[PDB]
Amino acid sequence: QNPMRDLKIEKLVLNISVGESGDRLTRASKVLEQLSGQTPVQSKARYTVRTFGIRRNEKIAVHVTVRGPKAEEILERGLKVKEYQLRDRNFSATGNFGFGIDEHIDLGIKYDPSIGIFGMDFYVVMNRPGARVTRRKRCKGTVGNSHKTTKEDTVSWFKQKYDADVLDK
């Protein structure tokens, strides 16, 4: 209908969350370093609950953000593991989606410290050209309703190339 009205993978955030901190976080950092190819960022604790074994500001998690082509190659690598099987859930009403995997270290061979299974949260953010108007410092504005990414638009975009299906089991 218009080339500027095309879905695109704006972002691919990649998250790991640990109940404690230490060498678990450090290896949670190398597993992100090897795949993304860039330094991951660790996260503080917003507040302490004394039931999940977490204290404020102790670096309990790690996550890294990837964009452009690399987000596509990583996404296909992670979706072949799921065999392109997602649900009716896992697609947010704002047009983003995501899933989770565990122990894909059998691909991307580093020295392979294969001592410890890591789960891994893929979340992907979809946008069309013009998302800059909501992020730029000057004259920041809000995307019009027609241009907004929705869950149906993301589902159709997925059911196209990436040749997948949803709501199944």
């Binding site: 410092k137 004259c139 920041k140």
Partner: protein
Amino acid sequence: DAKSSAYSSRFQTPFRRRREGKTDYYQRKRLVTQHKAKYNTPKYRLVVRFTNKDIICQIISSTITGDVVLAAAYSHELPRYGITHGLTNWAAAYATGLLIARRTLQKLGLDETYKGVEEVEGEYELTEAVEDGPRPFKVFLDIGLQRTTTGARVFGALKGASDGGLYVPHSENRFPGWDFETEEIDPELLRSYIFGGHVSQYMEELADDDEERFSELFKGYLADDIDADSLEDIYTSAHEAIRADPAFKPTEKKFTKEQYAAESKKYRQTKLSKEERAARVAAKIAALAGQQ
């Protein structure tokens, strides 16, 4: 969703230009407010603004009814001086600052004195007040919502205007060639970027590296047969032409504003009157009540 009526009634809107995201009123207050014991002395502001495709350089004072432009200079008028390419790159911003400086000094008759840095070297300099003569014209840089970066184009327009012979206070902390690890300037690097050295060195490197992207970018240089080497020469000749006549010849303005008004008056949807609004609501009822 679901904006409640009480939310709407109790909502206080920002100032219009804050809603539009153009004016920073925190910075504008300190930019504009004058010492009350200088009762009616204007405080002049070098507004430097970058769109895509253009650089707007204006000297602006403030009144209650609105702002006043002492002088205006634009990057799109640089063709009549010699630069038709890169009308937004850092050297073009320098030439626009040089232009607004020479133009404002000519308008105020303060150009025989305060001729500024005639020969560019890249050194850090201020318009010094002459002995027993008039003080240099005072202007303070305004950059709006632009972030402050060592090497940003606003400070290139700042540098050009300073060299143009108007007094604009500034440090050298944000020019290209400054190092945070070693607090000093690179006069040679600053000068080279003033004369387009960054983009000229780019097309030099790009030409050998790969010619297809050297044909996509810098297509216009190829089109009119401009080498990288001549970019230094054209900027030098353009600064001299700017110093020759900064007079601002305006456009001949074909199709006078009355028929601009006439032609653009037929592309705006007219507001429907209150009677026609009653007709529209009556028609919507009547179609709905027609028993299908």
